[PDB]
Amino acid sequence: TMKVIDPQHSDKPNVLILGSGWGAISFLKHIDTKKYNVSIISPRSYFLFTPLLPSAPVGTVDEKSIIEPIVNFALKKKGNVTYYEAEATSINPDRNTVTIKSLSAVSQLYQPENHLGLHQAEPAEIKYDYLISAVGAEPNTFGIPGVTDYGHFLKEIPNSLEIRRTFAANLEKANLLPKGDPERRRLLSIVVVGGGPTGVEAAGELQDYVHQDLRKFLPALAEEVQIHLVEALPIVLNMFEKKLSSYAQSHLENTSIKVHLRTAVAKVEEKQLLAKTKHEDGKITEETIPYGTLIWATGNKARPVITDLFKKIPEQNSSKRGLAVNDFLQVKGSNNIFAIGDNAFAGLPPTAQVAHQEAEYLAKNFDKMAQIPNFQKNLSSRKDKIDLLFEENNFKPFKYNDLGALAYLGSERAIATIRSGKRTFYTGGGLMTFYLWRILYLSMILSARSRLKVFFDWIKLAFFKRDFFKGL
Amino acid sequence: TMKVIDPQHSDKPNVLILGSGWGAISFLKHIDTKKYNVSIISPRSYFLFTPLLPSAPVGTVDEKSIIEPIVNFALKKKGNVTYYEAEATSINPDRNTVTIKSLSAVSQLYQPENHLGLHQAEPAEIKYDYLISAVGAEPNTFGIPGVTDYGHFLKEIPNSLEIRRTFAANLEKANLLPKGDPERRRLLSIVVVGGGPTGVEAAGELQDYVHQDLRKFLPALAEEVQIHLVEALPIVLNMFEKKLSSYAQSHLENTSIKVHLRTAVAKVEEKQLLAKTKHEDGKITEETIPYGTLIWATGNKARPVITDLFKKIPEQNSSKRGLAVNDFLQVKGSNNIFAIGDNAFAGLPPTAQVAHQEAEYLAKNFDKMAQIPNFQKNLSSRKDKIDLLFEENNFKPFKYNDLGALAYLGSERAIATIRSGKRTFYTGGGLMTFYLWRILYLSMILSARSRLKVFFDWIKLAFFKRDFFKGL
Ligand SMILES: Cc1cc2nc3c(=O)[nH]c(=O)nc-3n(C[C@H](O)[C@H](O)[C@H](O)COP(=O)(O)OP(=O)(O)OC[C@H]3O[C@@H](n4cnc5c(N)ncnc54)[C@H](O)[C@@H]3O)c2cc1C
Ligand SMILES: Cc1cc2nc3c(=O)[nH]c(=O)nc-3n(C[C@H](O)[C@H](O)[C@H](O)COP(=O)(O)OP(=O)(O)OC[C@H]3O[C@@H](n4cnc5c(N)ncnc54)[C@H](O)[C@@H]3O)c2cc1C
Ligand SMILES: NC(=O)C1=CN([C@@H]2O[C@H](COP(=O)(O)OP(=O)(O)OC[C@H]3O[C@@H](n4cnc5c(N)ncnc54)[C@H](O)[C@@H]3O)[C@@H](O)[C@H]2O)C=CC1
Ligand SMILES: NC(=O)C1=CN([C@@H]2O[C@H](COP(=O)(O)OP(=O)(O)OC[C@H]3O[C@@H](n4cnc5c(N)ncnc54)[C@H](O)[C@@H]3O)[C@@H](O)[C@H]2O)C=CC1
Ligand SMILES: [Mg+2]
Ligand SMILES: [Mg+2]
Ligand SMILES: [Mg+2]
Ligand SMILES: [Mg+2]
Ligand SMILES: [Mg+2]
Ligand SMILES: [Mg+2]
């Protein structure tokens, strides 16, 4: 009753990739398609360059500029790549299969295709020799009531649209109200929850729009908007040196953002939220904050398809943040499942930088496995010896090299620490750091198209106001 | 019970503009805001550069590139401009008022604003000294059944989005079906009704996408798409010389578009439509054409707010296509209403070219009226003498100067006839004509921002495939 897709007209092993983000796409770019048959399953038909996402809701860059269709990467590959636009709902380790639903499309980027006989919204299972799981993670509310109903995450392209639509609508209503009206004040207030670089960059970009663009035509309205950054810890950007945090904070306050440190949002309602401050002496105070737009940026948690998999594998039952993997990024308790990026946990920070390095490491290992006939064989055997094969052939374990971190702060200021190994090549903040931020980001974009478009967005920004359309 | 906005803290006359299109915006650009107070009512907060609309559904240019916010033009003005984002529902000539509904926003681009006390979705009446009606026209179905339910117009930005979403969705379903499936064939078929430059350019742009971009990754699918152009007359592009029509048609057919001349769509159903051919000898044949995407481009008709006004003015009861105006673009039967663009009819073709010339002419006349105290006065008087005042001060009547016409045909070919007076400076077709088409269109764009963005779209097109996202 359940269709099974199992391509056996090739001697090449079938590598199945879950996702189309940093892990999946970086892997796709490096994997040898002459040696392997690659399929990809993802509900999102494009790669998202997440570091510029915070700059999309206000039109600093356009949404289209920071995404790139999977097919464009796949076209660069010499062999057979297939992309299933669908969601993996169940990983089935013992039969080597992935169950997919919400299938919208299947693209076989190779001349003599085989008709698969799939139908939209018809469930199916896709058979693999090797599985690479990179479905990332999903926004964490920490069980705080109301965040899902009344706030916006900042995680995917639709969030950027949603945020713009909410704020634009609020600006229109507010401007019809007389100055000093408390409801007007509420509609013009934005709360960003989470003082990591995502929340900070989101807050800075909104303040940029308000101060540079909105001010040009509705200056009274612009002057009344109030952005709040709410952070539970005693400092923002706690992954940087404290002096950079301290710079960032003063800068944000200087651009008129209100920064609430040692403060947690305890509850969210439709038009107000409850924030609690734990002061340095142990005393707790409370504040009710009326808000028009709520952006929630407090980190992520494992997706259901992954938590479900925790249960199916004895070695993973104690897993919580993500799949536990060995030195070779092999899922523990599994012979042929690998996991990279945010859906795997090995103590490293959940960043694009880690995902990208994992992917490139994993793809090199696949180059080597293709030179050792035995890896091919153990798939057929009933004994799982692949982890043994790694040590026995002296594959080096994955070693992460932290290259540093960057954060834009609004008003043409950024902080940046650039590293490699024990060496620091750059660490500071300011105007020049902002130009460095731009240049480095441009460098890290995965495609020429997206790189050109972001570059064009920035040039237009030199001369003209940001596009800020409610329905576009 | 109905609020009335009536600004009388100035001695300047209140000029009210309906629309934000070719007529309205061109007028706005030339009207003297030192002599007049200008308000604008339009449900669309941006100007649309219509000649590039056919090239938006497939991402040849982006939707954002060809629109420009009204506020951007208004900011260039020295005096007081106010923009009501709302729809005029009733023109009330005897009380000099316009009734508005669906109010979303009001923007007063001047420092000391007066709180108007308006509310969203609260009806209001806006009082004028002078009314300039430029609300354009709306798509005509000629009463053919089903066109509204099952087809798409190509008239406004949302149409471009709808068309993209339909075709993209069809491409996905079709590709899941085996080659030769008749349903697959249907899903890959597009019918464009109307052989004017709008239908032709739409067809050519779609064929461009299919041949240049889709073919790169799904060549089997691309090869099966079939675009149909259906035109009731015996030639396409009948406003051009027959030899250019003849060149266009051969070119279209050469790019694989099927052109059905002497053929009219008589009925439209969800998955098929009925087309009837009246042959040169008088014989009528019929064909049922299955289709996946239907684009309906057969010209326009008067909007309800305008037809309603026909009834309120004795001199306009016989009006059908639009408001009847005199030599000075004054609505007949009215002392202080003027009409330009497609909502007025004076025998001239309904084009942007005519609308733009009318607007600039009308604005010059307003410069002159401001030097003749009497125009100001007749507003107060009960006798309507403004039309007399025009002749008596020897204002010249409006004289249209046809500058020619242009049409893109797909695959880097265009036709173009450039005129002025009796002189023809250019008339022909081909590759160079296509480069001319681009350069002239860039020249005609009303703002630097939009012009830069279109220019960047074309450059990116030189290197990369068109963006064709279903949900963006
Ligand atoms: C706003 C923002 C800014 C960021 N900035 C930085 C930064 O500046 N520097 C940095 O180092 N990191 C940054 N990050 C973090 C970085 O984006 C993540 O660590 C990175 O995405 C992890 O890569 P991933 O492949 O594991 O997940 P992702 O890149 O999120 O990709 C996951 C993929 O899986 C797909 N998927 C989801 N569910 C399923 C399913 N059930 N079946 C199949 N596929 C599925 C998704 O659609 C997506 O295609 C930022 C994150 C955000 C949200
Ligand atoms: C796809 C396409 C391509 C075209 N290409 C060309 C070309 O290449 N060359 C050429 O010369 N002409 C071209 N035209 C024709 C040209 O666009 C029209 O003749 C022109 O729009 C007429 O100008 P207008 O101001 O009367 O109407 P529009 O420019 O359409 O403006 C009407 C305005 O009124 C607003 N409005 C609608 N209803 C109301 C309401 N009730 N109250 C207040 N405002 C309202 C609309 O939102 C819009 O802003 C093209 C048209 C289309 C659709
Ligand atoms: N923008 C960027 O450059 C980067 C962003 N990231 C993102 O950061 C995440 C990893 O860091 P995390 O610490 O998980 O998130 P984070 O780094 O975005 O910071 C979240 C912050 O929100 C605060 N917070 C949590 N609950 C709160 C509440 N109820 N009220 C107020 N504040 C609250 C926490 O103190 C925490 O510091 C990843 O999921 C990734 O998406 C990761 C790398 C880089
Ligand atoms: N794209 C461009 O360059 C320009 C386009 N226009 C548009 O042209 C319109 C004015 O010219 P029109 O002749 O009214 O429209 P049109 O010039 O766009 O062409 C419509 C054509 O469709 C055909 N048609 C009508 N009903 C049909 C049916 N049931 N089946 C098949 N064919 C049918 C007609 O013969 C007509 O030639 C305006 O609405 C304006 O928007 C105007 C100026 C320039
Ligand atoms: Mg398995
Ligand atoms: Mg939501
Ligand atoms: Mg809200
Ligand atoms: Mg006045
Ligand atoms: Mg329709
Ligand atoms: Mg064809």
Swiss-Prot record, chains A, B:
Q: EC number(s) of the enzyme? A: 1.6.5.9
Obligatory cofactor(s):
FAD
**Where is this chain primarily localised?**
mitochondrion
| The keyword Mitochondrion belongs to this UniProt entry's keyword annotation | yes
Molecular-function GO term, any one: identical protein binding
Q: Which GO terms describe its biological process?
A: mitochondrial electron transport, NADH to ubiquinone; positive regulation of apoptotic process
Q: Where NAD(+) is bound, by residue?
A: 188-224
Membrane topology (UniProt): Peripheral membrane protein
Q: Which Pfam families match?
A: NDH2_C, Pyr_redox_2
Keywords recorded for this protein, A-Z: FAD, Flavoprotein, Membrane, Mitochondrion, Mitochondrion inner membrane, NAD, Oxidoreductase, Transit peptide, Ubiquinone
What subcellular compartments does it reside in? Mitochondrion inner membrane
SUPFAM superfamilies assigned to the protein according to its UniProt record, in alphabetical order? FAD/NAD(P)-binding domain
InterPro entries, A to Z: FAD/NAD-bd_sf (IPR036188), FAD/NAD-binding_dom (IPR023753), NDH-2 (IPR045024), NDH2-like_C (IPR054585)
Protein origin, superkingdom: Eukaryota
Instruction: List ligand-binding residues for FAD.
Output: 14-44
GO CC term, one of those recorded:
mitochondrial matrix
Q: What else is known?
A: Present with 5240 molecules/cell in log phase SD medium.
State the function annotated in the UniProt record: Catalyzes the oxidation of NADH generated inside the Mitochondrion.
| Family of the protein in this entry | Belongs to the NADH dehydrogenase family.
What this protein is called in its record is: Rotenone-insensitive NADH-ubiquinone oxidoreductase, mitochondrial
Protein's organism: Saccharomyces cerevisiae (strain ATCC 204508 / S288c)
